[PDB]
Design a protein around this ligand. Structure first.
Ligand SMILES: [Zn+2]
Ligand SMILES: [Zn+2]
Lengths: 58, 101, 1451, 57
RNA sequence: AUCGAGAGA
DNA sequence: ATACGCTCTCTGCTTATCGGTAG
DNA sequence: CTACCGATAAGCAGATCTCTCGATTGCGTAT
C-alpha cells in the first residue's frame, strides 16, 4: 500500500507498479467501470416503452 | 420376372427413342459452348490419364489437359455432347461436328 | 473421390414417407430397455453392442470393428402411442371437425366428394378440369346426390383418360409449381371449410368441442343446456391417446376416399391406404452408437444429450410399465377405490410425463433445454446450413497475402510451406514417369516430390518415413505390369506436390460475387508463409495488403482443373457481369509511373530503351510472339539518337500483340486536362494508330479498370489472353521504370505560394459573417442585424427546440459555407500551389487517379470545410452551446462545425473535436454498411440458384418452369456487350475484327438469308408504323428474335441493335463498304450471345446484391427490402407520379395539387377554449380558426365546407369520444333551425352556432349528466380535431408539384389510389400515371404493369447512387417474382410454391417444410441445386447442363 | 463467491442490482504493453445492452 | 460442448 | 467423510369477437 | 331470427467473413 519504488523492486513487483486489479487463479482481472445514471437527480424521460408498458400509459 | 424386366426394358428404350431428336432437325447452337469445351477437355484428360489410346503425336508434353487441348485443336476427340432440352429431349452433337469459337 | 473406383448406381430421386411401427420393429437390431448406459456397455442399454461397435468391442450385429461398422438402429417400445410433435397440428385439425357418432367429417358428404374429385384431378396437370367440375352443380334427395356424385366421378375419370391419351399427363402425374399452388390452396380451403362447422351433416349429432394448451394435452368440453336440447331430440375432460387414436382411425378408415387425395400430391401406384397410426409414435427409433458416441474432451467426459433424453423416456416408460402391474392388483382384487384413484391419477400423470419426454426427445421448444433432434437441423448452426450448404475441405490452405509484381497477372505465389503439404493425385503412365519418378526420388521433403504412392488396389503407401534408397526402388517399380487380373485396368497414382503447371482456386471472404473466387496459376516461390498476389487482382477480390488473408483451394481431378483453367480462370473474368465494365488492371505506382513515362519530357538513349524493352518483355518466357525482339527507329536522329516513352509503349504493343494482324486504332481521352501541360498541349487526347501511341498520356483510364481504354480495346480485339499479357508486361515495365526514376511525395508538395496563401486568407476572411447572415435569413429577419439581437436569439432558441427548423438552419448554413469552400479551393488549386504538376506528386496522384482525389488535396492544402454529421452540422447542447468554448446561440460558421483549417497547418481544438465527431460517425457507418446488405444476397440466391439458360435460349428454373423466353429479350451476354454499339471503334479495327471472327469458317454452318429477309420486312413495317401508340398498333410481325434462333441465323438481331446499326450506316458514309461492315457487326452480334447453361439467376442475384454494399422516399437497403425481400403491399412511402397536360399552367397545376391534397380540421384551428361549468356537467367548446382570407387561400377551404364538416363529422366524433370515455370511467330563423337540427341529430349538444359572415368562430355548448366524473375535454378534443378531415381523397396524403426534371412536368402524391385520379382527366395525362407501389399497380393494371414497376423501382435504387446494374438482371428478377401473376417475394412465404422441398428446408423453417413434404408424400426428382448437393449429385447448371458420350469404334 | 464473480463476470444475484446486464462485469487486464495496461484503467463502458442493438444515437 | 471478453479484413 | 439422487428491437402470418346480408 | 363471411385488435415465428482467450449445478443425506 505505501511501499516506495525501491521497496517495490525489492519485493519483486515493479518500479512503479500500479493497482486497481485483482489476481484470481494467477490471471489478473479488473472490474471495468460502467456508466450509470446521475444519482439523486430526477430527470424527465420520454420513452416509447413507457407507453408500451401497458394501456393509457403515456 | 424375366418378362417383367423385358417389358420394363422395352418401355425404357421406347421412352429413350421418343426423347431423342434426330440429326436432321436439331435447332441448337452450331458452336461448342465454353462449358462444353471445358467439360470435354476435362473428360478427355481423365480418359487419357487413365491409360487410354491416344491419336495425336505427343511433343514430349505430360499434362493430360494440354494433350486434350492438342486433340481438340486437331479435332481428334472421340466424344459426343448430349445437349438436354428442358423436357428431357436430347440432341447428340459430335465434337468434330461443332465449331470451336 | 478416387477416380479409379467408378460408381454404377445413382439416386434418381428421393420421396418423403412415414416410418411405420411394423417395419422399424422388423428392421431394428435390438430393443433398448434399461435407462443405464454404462456399468462397459450395458447389455440392453443405449450403447448395446447390437447398435454398432464401441471402443474395441466388435459389433454384435455385423461383427466388425469401429471402422467397418456403419451403425444400426434400435427401437424402444413405448407402452402407449404418443402424439408425434411434428404432426400434432394436423392431428388436432382432423380431430376437430369430425363426428364421433357417424365417424365421418361434419362437412356434407357431397362436398367432401367434390373436394376429393378436384384433388384427384389436380394430382394430374388438369387445373382447368378441376375448375370445370364446379359447374356440374345439380343439375344435371339422397338418390339425386348419389347420381350427382357418380356423374362427377365419371367426369373425372373421362378427363383423366383424355389427358393420358392426348399426352398432357402420364400415369405418374404432372406436378409443377402452379399445380402445387392450386393443390395447396384447395387443401387449405378444404381444412378451413371443415373447421368452420357446428353440427354434423350426415347425422345431426352435435359433437363435443376440443381445446388446446400447447402439446401433449388435448381436452374436450361438454355441450350446453340449449345445445343438448337438440341432443335430447336426436335420440374439462382429459381424453386419452388411445381414445383419440381410435377416433381418428375410424374417421380415416371411413374417409379413405378423400384422404388418399388430401395426403398425396402425385398418384400412388401401390394404392397404400392412408392410416391414422402414422400420426402416432408407439415406437421410437434410436440412432446408432456411431451417431451417438460420447462427447469426450480429455478428462472432461460428458454424456450425449440424445442419450440423456432417451434415458428419460426409458425411465418414464419403465415407470409406466411398473405402474401397470400394481394397478392390476387394485383391479383384480376387490379393493376400495381411493387407492385405485391415486394409482390411476399417478398413471395419468405418467402418461403426460412420457408424452413430454417424447416431445423433448423430438423437439426442445415444446418440452437451457437440451437440444433435441429438431434443433440439430433448424438454423444457421443447424445441420443443413452448416454441414450441407457449407463444409470443411481437404486440400486447402490459408495465409496472409503479400504483393508481388514479378509474377504473372494470372498467377499466384505459393510458399514452399504450402507447396510441400498440398498435393495432387497424378496417375502414372508411359508418358509421365519422367517427372513422377523424379518426384518420388525427391520424396516428401524436397520439392517437387511425392508424399504418397497409391497402389493399384487402393493401398496408400506413405514416403514420409522412408529412406532415399527405398524411395528410388519404389520409383523404379512405379510403372509395372499388373500381376492381378482383377486390377489390370488401373495404374498407380502419385500424390506429387503442387507444381507450376497445377491450377489453384483463390477466395477472399466475404464472397460477394463470383469474381471474388478465381482460378489462378501456381508459381512455387522460394520464400515462405505468404500468398503472393499481383496488383490486378486487388480490385477483383477487394483485397488489400494490410493484413488481409485469403484461402487457396486445390482441385484434385482433371475435370476441376479444366473447369478452373478455362471457366473460372483469372483472365476470362476481365469484365464484371454486373455492368460489363472491366475489373482488372494496375493501381497506384504503375499509374504514376505511366503518367511520368508517357509524357513528351521523357527521352531514352538506345541502351536505356533496349533495357526497358527487355525488362518488360522476355521472349524466353513466351512473352514475345516474334521469337526476336523488334525495335523502332528513334524519334530523334541528330545530334544523337533519342527515343520516347510513347515509343516504349509502341514497342511493347508491337512485341506482345500477335503479328499478321493490324495494330489497334483507338481514340480516347485521359483524366489529365490539357491545361496541366501548358498552352497548346494535346496530351489529354490519347491516340493510337496501327498500334503506335502517337499522342496523349497513358493514365488510369487506359490501363486499369476503365472501359474503352487501351487494355479494354486490346481485350476486345485480341482476346483475353493478350489483354492479360499486356497487363503483366505493363506491370513489369512500370516497375522497372519506377526503380530507376523513383516516385516520391513530401512536404513541398503540400505547400502553397505566398500569393496562394494570401488568396486563401482573403477569401476565408469573408466566412466570418456567413453564419450570421444565414441565421438571419432563416429566422426571417432583415439583413445587417447584430449577432446578439434579442429577437434573433429568441428565434434561434425556437429553432434549437424544433428539430425541423434546426435542420433547415443547418442546410442553409451548410450551403453558404460550402459555397465559400468551393471558392477557396477553385481559387487556390492549382494556381496558388508552390510545386506544380507534374513535379507536384500530390496533384499528380490526385489528377492521375493513382490515389486520392481533389477533395483530399483540397483538405490537405486549402481547408477542411463544413463537418457534416448525420446530414446536419455538429450537435448543439440544451443550452444553445455547441461546445463549452462557444457562447450560447453563437452565429458563427466555426461554431457550427466549419473547419477553416488544413492538415498541412493543423486544426484548432474545437475543429479537432468536430472532426473527431465526423470521423466517428463515418467509422460507425462503414461498420454497419459492411454487412447491412448480407441477408438480401442469400434471400435472392436461394430462389435464383437454379435459374439458368437452356438450349432453347429461354431462361428457366431448375425443375423446368419457364421464367423468360429469351435472356434480356436479346440473349446478349453482358460481358460481351461492351463493343457492340462501338461502331466507330469496330470500323477503325475492321481488319483485326475480321481476322478474329473468321467468317470463312462461319458460313457453311449458318443460314444467312432468311433471317435477313424477315428483319428487312419487319423493319420496313415498323418504319411505316410507329407514329401511333403501342396499344393501337397491330403486330402482324413478331420480332426476328422470336422466329429465328439468334445463334443459328445470321441477321437475327434485336430491334435496338438493328436500329442503331442502320442509323450509324446512314449517318456516316465513310476503304470498306457498308455491306461488309454490316455483315461483320451482325456476326459480332451472333458471337456475343449468352451460352446455354449460364447461371443467369446466380449472376443476377450477385450483381444486385454486391453493388448494394456500395450504398423523401426510402432508398438503398430499406427500399430493396421493401421491393425484393418481402414485397410489402404497404410501403413506407407510397407515391404515384401524375403527368400533366401541356396546356395546364404551373399555377393551375399548383391549384390542382392544393385541391387534391388532404386537409385535416386541425389545420385551420387557431385555438380551442373549453369553458367547463358544473353549476349538469356542461362544456362550451369555442373553436377559433384563422382568418378566412388566410385559410381559404392556403387550403381552398371555405366557410360553407368548414361548417359542413363541423356539423357532420367533428361533432359526431366528439360525441363518440365523450361517450367512450364516460363508459371507460365507469369501470335569423335559419340559424335557429340549424341549431335545432344539430341538437336533434346529436346526443347531448345544447347550443350551436358559427361565424356565418366571417368563418372565425364555432362556439357550441355541450352538456352531460351530473353523475359523470371530470373529463379532460382538451386532450380528446385535440385528438378529434386531428382525426376529422375537411377535404380528403382516399389514401392521398399530399400532392406536390416538384420542379420539372427531364423536361416533363410531373406531380407526386403521397399514397396510391389509381381509380381516384382517373376522374381528373382535365389536368392529368391519365394514361401515363405510374406509382411506387407495385401492389397497387398489380391490382389495378395487371401483372405486366407490376413487372415494369418492379424493374423501374429496383433500378431506381441503384441509379440514385450512380451504380449501374444491367437491366437483364432486373428483368430476370422481376420475371422470377411475378411468375405466378402475383407480386411474390424472396422469402419463405413466396418459396412455398416450389417443386423441390430440399431447397426450402435448407433455406429455413426446416421442420415445417419437412412435415409438409412428408404429409403429401412429395417426391422431388433432385432438380434444384440445393437438392443436388444435399444428395451429392452433379449440379445441373453450367458444365452439368449436358452429358458426354464416347464413340467406341466397335458395335 | 466473490472469486467466482471476479473470474466469470457473472452477477449471480438473488435480488438483482439496479443494473441492466448480468454478465461481463470483469475484464482480464491484458499485458500486451504498458499502453494497453494503463488504458485498461481509464475506460468506461456504456454496457453490453447497447452492443446488441440497431439505434446509433 | 456452451456463454462471456476481445482481436483481424 | 463420502457416493449418489436429482429490466427499453423489425417484419408478416394466424386467431378472436363484432359488423353486415340472406333464407 | 340465426348462420356465415369479412375485418381490425391481439397473439406468435424468425435471420440480420476469419481468429484468440477465459469460465464450467446447488442442495441433501443417510449413515
Ligand atoms: Zn455393426
Ligand atoms: Zn355424424
Amino acid at each position: 500500500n505505501k511501499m516506495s519504488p525501491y521497496e517495490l523492486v525489492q519485493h519483486k513487483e515493479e518500479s512503479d507498479e500500479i493497482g486497481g486489479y485483482f489476481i484470481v487463479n494467477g490471471i489478473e482481472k479488473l472490474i471495468r467501470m460502467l456508466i450509470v445514471q446521475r444519482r439523486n437527480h430526477p430527470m424527465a424521460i420520454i420513452r416509447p416503452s413507457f407507453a408500451n408498458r401497458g394501456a393509457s400509459y403515456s | 420376372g424375366p418378362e417383367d424386366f423385358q417389358q420394363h426394358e422395352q418401355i425404357r428404350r421406347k421412352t429413350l427413342k421418343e426423347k431423342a431428336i434426330p440429326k436432321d432437325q436439331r435447332a441448337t447452337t452450331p458452336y461448342m459452348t465454353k462449358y462444353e469445351r471445358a467439360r470435354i477437355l476435362g473428360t478427355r484428360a481423365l480418359q487419357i490419364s487413365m491409360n487410354a489410346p491416344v491419336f495425336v503425336d505427343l511433343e514430349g508434353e505430360t499434362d493430360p489437359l494440354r494433350i486434350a487441348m492438342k486433340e481438340l485443336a486437331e479435332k481428334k476427340i472421340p466424344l459426343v455432347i448430349r445437349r438436354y432440352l428442358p423436357d428431357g429431349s436430347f440432341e447428340d452433337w459430335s465434337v468434330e461436328e461443332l465449331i470451336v469459337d | 473421390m478416387d477416380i479409379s473406383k467408378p460408381v454404377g448406381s445413382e439416386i434418381t430421386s428421393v420421396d418423403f414417407g412415414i416410418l411405420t411401427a411394423k417395419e422399424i420393429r422388423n428392421l431394428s437390431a435390438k430393443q433398448i430397455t434399461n435407462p443405464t448406459v454404462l456399468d462397459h456397455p450395458v447389455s440392453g442399454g443405449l450403447y448395446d453392442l447390437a447398435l454398432g461397435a464401441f471402443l474395441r468391442n466388435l459389433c454384435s450385429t455385423c461383427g466388425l470393428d469401429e471402422k467397418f461398422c456403419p451403425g444400426h438402429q434400435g427401437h424402444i417400445e413405448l407402452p402407449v402411442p404418443c402424439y408425434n410433435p411434428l404432426f400434432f397440428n394436423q392431428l388436432y385439425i382432423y380431430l376437430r371437425a369430425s363426428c364421433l357418432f357417424c365417424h365421418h367429417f361434419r362437412l356434407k358428404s357431397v362436398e367432401v366428394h367434390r373436394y376429393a374429385c378436384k384433388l384427384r384431378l389436380l394430382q394430374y396437370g388438369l387445373i382447368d378440369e378441376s375448375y370445370k367440375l364446379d359447374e356440374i352443380t345439380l343439375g344435371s334427395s339422397s338418390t339425386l346426390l348419389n347420381e350427382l356424385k357418380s356423374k362427377r366421378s365419371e367426369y373425372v375419370d373421362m378427363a383423366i383418360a383424355k389427358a393420358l391419351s392426348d399426352g398432357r399427363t402420364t400415369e405418374r402425374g404432372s406436378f409443377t409449381a402452379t399445380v402445387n399452388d392450386e393443390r395447396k390452396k384447395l387443401v387449405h380451403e378444404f381444412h378451413k371449410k371443415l373447421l368452420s362447422r357446428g353440427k354434423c351433416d350426415n347425422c345431426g349429432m352435435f359433437s363435443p368441442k376440443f381445446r388446446k394448451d400447447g402439446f401433449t394435452k388435448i381436452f374436450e368440453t361438454a355441450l350446453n343446456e340449449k345445445q343438448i336440447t337438440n341432443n335430447r331430440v336426436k335420440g374439462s375432460t382429459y381424453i386419452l391417446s388411445t381414445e383419440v387414436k381410435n377416433i381418428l382411425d375410424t374417421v380415416f378408415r371411413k374417409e379413405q376416399c378423400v384422404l388418399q387425395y388430401v395426403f398425396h400430391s402425385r398418384p400412388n401406384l401401390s394404392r397404400k391406404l392412408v392410416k391414422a397410426d402414422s400420426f402416432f409414435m408407439d415406437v421410437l427409433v434410436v440412432p446408432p452408437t456411431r451417431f451417438r458416441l460420447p462427447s469426450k474432451l480429455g478428462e472432461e467426459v460428458h454424456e450425449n444429450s440424445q442419450n440423456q433424453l432417451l434415458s428419460k423416456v426409458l425411465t418414464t416408460s419403465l415407470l409406466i410399465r411398473d405402474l401397470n402391474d400394481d394397478l392390476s392388483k387394485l383391479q383384480k382384487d376387490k379393493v376400495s377405490l381411493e387407492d385405485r384413484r391415486v394409482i390411476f391419477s399417478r398413471l395419468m400423470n405418467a402418461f403426460v410425463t412420457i408424452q413430454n419426454d417424447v416431445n423433448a426427445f423430438i423437439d426442445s421448444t415444446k418440452a437451457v433445454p437440451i437440444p433435441g433432434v429438431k434443433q440439430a437441423l433448424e438454423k444457421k448452426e443447424g445441420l443443413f446450413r452448416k454441414h450441407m450448404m457449407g463444409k470443411r475441405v481437404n486440400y486447402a490452405a490459408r495465409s496472409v497475402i503479400s504483393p508481388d509484381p514479378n509474377i504473372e497477372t494470372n498467377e499466384i505465389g505459393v510458399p514452399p510451406v504450402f507447396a510441400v503439404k498440398l498435393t495432387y493425385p497424378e496417375p502414372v503412365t508411359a508418358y509421365n514417369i519422367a517427372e513422377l519418378r523424379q518426384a518420388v526420388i525427391n520424396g516428401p521433403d524436397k520439392w517437387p516430390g511425392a508424399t504418397q504412392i497409391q497402389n493399384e488396389d487402393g493401398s496408400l503407401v506413405s514416403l514420409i518415413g522412408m529412406s532415399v534408397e527405398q524411395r528410388k526402388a519404389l520409383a523404379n517399380q512405379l510403372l509395372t505390369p499388373s500381376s492381378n487380373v482383377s486390377t489390370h485396368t488401373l495404374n498407380k497414382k502419385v500424390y506429387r506436390h503442387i507444381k507450376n503447371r497445377d491450377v489453384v482456386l483463390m477466395n477472399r471472404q466475404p464472397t460477394l460475387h463470383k469474381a471474388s473466387m478465381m482460378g489462378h496459376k501456381v508459381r512455387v516461390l522460394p520464400n515462405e508463409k505468404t500468398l503472393r498476389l499481383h496488383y490486378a487482382n486487388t480490385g477483383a477480390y477487394n483485397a488489400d495488403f494490410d493484413g488481409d488473408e485469403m484461402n487457396m483451394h486445390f482441385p484434385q481431378n482433371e475435370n476441376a482443373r479444366a473447369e478452373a483453367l478455362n471457366l473460372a480462370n483469372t483472365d476470362s473474368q476481365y469484365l464484371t457481369p454486373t455492368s460489363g465494365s472491366p475489373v482488372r488492371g494496375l493501381i497506384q505506382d504503375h499509374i504514376s509511373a505511366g503518367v511520368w513515362l508517357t509524357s513528351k519530357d521523357s527521352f531514352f538513349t538506345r541502351e536505356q530503351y533496349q533495357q526497358y524493352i527487355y525488362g518488360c518483355i522476355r521472349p524466353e518466357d513466351g512473352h514475345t510472339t516474334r521469337s526476336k525482339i523488334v525495335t523502332l527507329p528513334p524519334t530523334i536522329f541528330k545530334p544523337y539518337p533519342l527515343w520516347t516513352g510513347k515509343q516504349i509503349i509502341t514497342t511493347v504493343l508491337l512485341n506482345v500483340t500477335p503479328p499478321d494482324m493490324p495494330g489497334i486504332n483507338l481514340i480516347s481521352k485521359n483524366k489529365i486536362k490539357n491545361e496541366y501541360w501548358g498552352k497548346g498541349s494535346l496530351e489529354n487526347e490519347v491516340l493510337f494508330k496501327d498500334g503506335a501511341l502517337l499522342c496523349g498520356i497513358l493514365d488510369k483510364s487506359q490501363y486499369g479498370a476503365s472501359k474503352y481504354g487501351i487494355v479494354h480495346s486490346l481485350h476486345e480485339v485480341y482476346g483475353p489472353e493478350v489483354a492479360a499479357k499486356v497487363l503483366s508486361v505493363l506491370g513489369r515495365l512500370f516497375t522497372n521504370y519506377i526503380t530507376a526514376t523513383a516516385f516520391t511525395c513530401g512536404m513541398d508538395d503540400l505547400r502553397l505560394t505566398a500569393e496562394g496563401n494570401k488568396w486563401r486568407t482573403d477569401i476565408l476572411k469573408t466566412s466570418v459573417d456567413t453564419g450570421r447572415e444565414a441565421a438571419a435569413e432563416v429566422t426571417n429577419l432583415d439583413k445587417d442585424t447584430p449577432a446578439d439581437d434579442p429577437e434573433l436569439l429568441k428565434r434561434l432558441q425556437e429553432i434549437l427546440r424544433d428539430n425541423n427548423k434546426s435542420g433547415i438552419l443547418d442546410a442553409v448554413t451548410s450551403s453558404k459555407v460550402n459555397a465559400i469552400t468551393s471558392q477557396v479551393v477553385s481559387k487556390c488549386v492549382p494556381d496558388g500551389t508552390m510545386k506544380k504538376f507534374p513535379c507536384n506528386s500530390m496533384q499528380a496522384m490526385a489528377l492521375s487517379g493513382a490515389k486520392g482525389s481533389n477533395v483530399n488535396v483540397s483538405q490537405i492544402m486549402c481547408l477542411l470545410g463544413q463537418q457534416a454529421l448525420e446530414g446536419r452540422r455538429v450537435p448543439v447542447m440544451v443550452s444553445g452551446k455547441t461546445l463549452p468554448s462557444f457562447k450560447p446561440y453563437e452565429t458563427d460558421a466555426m461554431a457550427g462545425g466549419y473547419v477553416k483549417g488544413r492538415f498541412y497547418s493543423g486544426i484548432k481544438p474545437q475543429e479537432y473535436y468536430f472532426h473527431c465527431m465526423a470521423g466517428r460517425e463515418g467509422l460507425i457507418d462503414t461498420a454497419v454498411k459492411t454487412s447491412r446488405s448480407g441477408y438480401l444476397q442469400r434471400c435472392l440466391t436461394k430462389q435464383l440458384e437454379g435459374v439458368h439458360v437452356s438450349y432453347d435460349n429461354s431462361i428457366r428454373d431448375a425443375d423446368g418452369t419457364l421464367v423468360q423466353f429469351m435472356y434480356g429479350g436479346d440473349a446478349i451476354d453482358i460481358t460481351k456487350e461492351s463493343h457492340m454499339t462501338q461502331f466507330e471503334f469496330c470500323l477503325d479495327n475492321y481488319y483485326a475484327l475480321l481476322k478474329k471472327y473468321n467468317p470463312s469458317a462461319l458460313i457453311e454452318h449458318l443460314d444467312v438469308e432468311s433471317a435477313l429477309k424477315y428483319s428487312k420486312k419487319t423493319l420496313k413495317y415498323r418504319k411505316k408504323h410507329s407514329k401511333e401508340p403501342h396499344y393501337k398498333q397491330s403486330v402482324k410481325y413478331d420480332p426476328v428474335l422470336a422466329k429465328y434462333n439468334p445463334a443459328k441465323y445470321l441477321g437475327s438481331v434485336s430491334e435496338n441493335f438493328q436500329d442503331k446499326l442502320e442509323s450509324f450506316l446512314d449517318k456516316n458514309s465513310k476503304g470498306v463498304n457498308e455491306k461488309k461492315f454490316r455483315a461483320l457487326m451482325q456476326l459480332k452480334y451472333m458471337r456475343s450471345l449468352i451460352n446455354p447453361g449460364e447461371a443467369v439467376g446466380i449472376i443476377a442475384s450477385q450483381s444486385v446484391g454486391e453493388p448494394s454494399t456500395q450504398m423523401n422516399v426510402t432508398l438503398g437497403i430499406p427500399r430493396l427490402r421493401e421491393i425484393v425481400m418481402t414485397a410489402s403491399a404497404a410501403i413506407k412511402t407510397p407515391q404515384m407520379t401524375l403527368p400533366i397536360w401541356n396546356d395546364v399552367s404551373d399555377e393551375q397545376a399548383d391549384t390542382f395539387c392544393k385541391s387534391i391534397s388532404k386537409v385535416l380540421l386541425s389545420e385551420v384551428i387557431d385555438k380551442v377554449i373549453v369553458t367547463e361549468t358544473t353549476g349538469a356537467r356542461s362544456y362550451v367548446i369555442h373553436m377559433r380558426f384563422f382568418d378566412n382570407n388566410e385559410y381559404s387561400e392556403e387550403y381552398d377551404v371555405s366557410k360553407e365546407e368548414l361548417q359542413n364538416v363541423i356539423s357532420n363529422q367533428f361533432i359526431h366524433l366528439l360525441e363518440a369520444a365523450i361517450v367512450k370515455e364516460i363508459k371507460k370511467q365507469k369501470r335569423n330563423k335559419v340559424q335557429r333551425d340549424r341549431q335545432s337540427a344539430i341538437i336533434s341529430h346529436h346526443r347531448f349538444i345544447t347550443k350551436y352556432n358559427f361565424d356565418d359572415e366571417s368563418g372565425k368562430w364555432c362556439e357550441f355548448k355541450l352538456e352531460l349528466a351530473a353523475d359523470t366524473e371530470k373529463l379532460l375535454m382538451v386532450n380528446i378534443v385535440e385528438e378529434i380535431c386531428r382525426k376529422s378531415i375537411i377535404r380528403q381523397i382516399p389514401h392521398i396524403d399530399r400532392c406536390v408539384h416538384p420542379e420539372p426534371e427531364n423536361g416533363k412536368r410531373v406531380l407526386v402524391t403521397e399514397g396510391v389510389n389509381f381509380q381516384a385520379m382517373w376522374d381528373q382527366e382535365a389536368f392529368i395525362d391519365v394514361d401515363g400515371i405510374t406509382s411506387n407501389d407495385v401492389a397497387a399497380v398489380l391490382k389495378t393494371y395487371g401483372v405486366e404493369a407490376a413487372r415494369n414497376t418492379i424493374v423501374n423501382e429496383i433500378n431506381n435504387v441503384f441509379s440514385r447512387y450512380a451504380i449501374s446494374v444491367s437491366f437483364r438482371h432486373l428483368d430476370l428478377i422481376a420475371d422470377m417474382m411475378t411468375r405466378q401473376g402475383t407480386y411474390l417475394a424472396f422469402n419463405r412465404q413466396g418459396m412455398e410454391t416450389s417443386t423441390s422441398s430440399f431447397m426450402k428446408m435448407s433455406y429455413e423453417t426446416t421442420c415445417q417444410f419437412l412435415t409438409k413434404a412428408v404429409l403429401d408424400n412429395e417426391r422431388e426428382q433432385l432438380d434444384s441445386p440445393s437438392a443436388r448437393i444435399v444428395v451429392g449429385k452433379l449440379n445441373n447448371v453450367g458444365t452439368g447442363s449436358f452429358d458426354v458420350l464416347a464413340k467406341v469404334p466397335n458395335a | 463467491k466473490m472469486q467466482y464473480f471476479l473470474s466469470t463476470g457473472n452477477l449471480v444475484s438473488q435480488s438483482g442490482l439496479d443494473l441492466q446486464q448480468v454478465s461481463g462485469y470483469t475484464v482480464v487486464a491484458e499485458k500486451i504493453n504498458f499502453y494497453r495496461f494503463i488504458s485498461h484503467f481509464r475506460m468506461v463502458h456504456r454496457g453490453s445492452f447497447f452492443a446488441q442493438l440497431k439505434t446509433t444515437t
